[PDB]
Structure formats: structure tokens, C-alpha cells
């Protein structure tokens, strides 16, 4: 009575944005696999590959957190308290592949942002999206410099 959560155009189209990501970054460890690449951060990189990989990964992301803005603006006047935490149950879902391909603090960008700024409104969700879009395009420049 509180806690439903996205509904409509709005659920097909973040839900589908999130997924191309998962469906990305899926994709990018079966071909490091068959190149034997370990994403493992300890292990601004050297690698050609890890450096296209990573610009590939941010692009399909932001292109998601951009949808999480749109969406979020629109809902600012009637959009539920359950709507925005479903928005922000996406973003910290898909920061975790991202970090597996070795961005490193990935989750703790969007959990963090979330402290400060809790997706208890569109408000709060704008800042979460801002941080996590911010942290994308950091990593996105450094890597197609290199590039
Ligand atoms: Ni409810």
C-alpha cells in the first residue's frame, strides 16, 4: 500500500536500459575469457582492451542513468516513494557489474550518494543519478584518452 513499484513506460524503459547493460557487460567477459583477460583491478590502465571494455561498459550505463533522470524528472510531481526506491534498487544493482570489470568502488558511488541523498524522493534520485553518471563519464574519459 506504499512500497509498489514502477509501472507502465516508465518500468519497461529503465528496466530495459538496466538489462542492456547486465547484457553488455556479460558479453565483454566472454570475449576477455577467450582472450584469457582478468578484469582483477590489482592486477589509467595498460591494456587496450580493458581500456575499450571500459569505455564500452560506461557508455551502455550512462545511457541507463540518463533514462533514471528522465524518468525521475517526469515523476517529480506524482511519482511514489516506492517508485523512486525501485530507481535506485537499479542503479545499485547494475553498479555491481561495473565494478566487476574493474571500476573500482562502483557500488560505494551509488550506496554513498544514497547516504547523503536517499531515493525517498525525485529529488534524492537526481543526486544519486548525478554521482553515479559523473562516476561513469570519469571513467569513460580517462579510458577513450588513453584510448
Ligand atoms: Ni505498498
Known amino acids: ?23 553488455e557487460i556479460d558479453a565483454i567477459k566472454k570475449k576477455a575469457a577467450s582472450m584469457g583477460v582478468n578484469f582483477d583491478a590489482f592486477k589509467v590502465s595498460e591494456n587496450p ?43 545499485f544493482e547494475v553498479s555491481k557489474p561495473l565494478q566487476e570489470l574493474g571500476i573500482q568502488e562502483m557500488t560505494k558511488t551509488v550506496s554513498m550518494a544514497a547516504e547523503e541523498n536517499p531515493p525517498t524522493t525525485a529529488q534524492g534520485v537526481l543526486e544519486i543519478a548525478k554521482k553515479m553518471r559523473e562516476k561513469l563519464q570519469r571513467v569513460h574519459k580517462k579510458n577513450q584518452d588513453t584510448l
Open 1 to 23: 500500500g506504499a512500497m509498489d513499484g514502477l509501472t507502465g513506460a516508465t518500468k519497461i524503459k529503465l528496466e530495459s536500459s538496466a538489462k542492456a547493460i547486465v547484457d
Open 49 to 91: 582492451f580493458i581500456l575499450e571494455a571500459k569505455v564500452r561498459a560506461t557508455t551502455v550505463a550512462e545511457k541507463f542513468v540518463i533514462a533514471i533522470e528522465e524518468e525521475a524528472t517526469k515523476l517529480k510531481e506524482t511519482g511514489s516513494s516506492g517508485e523512486f526506491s525501485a530507481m535506485y534498487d537499479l542503479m
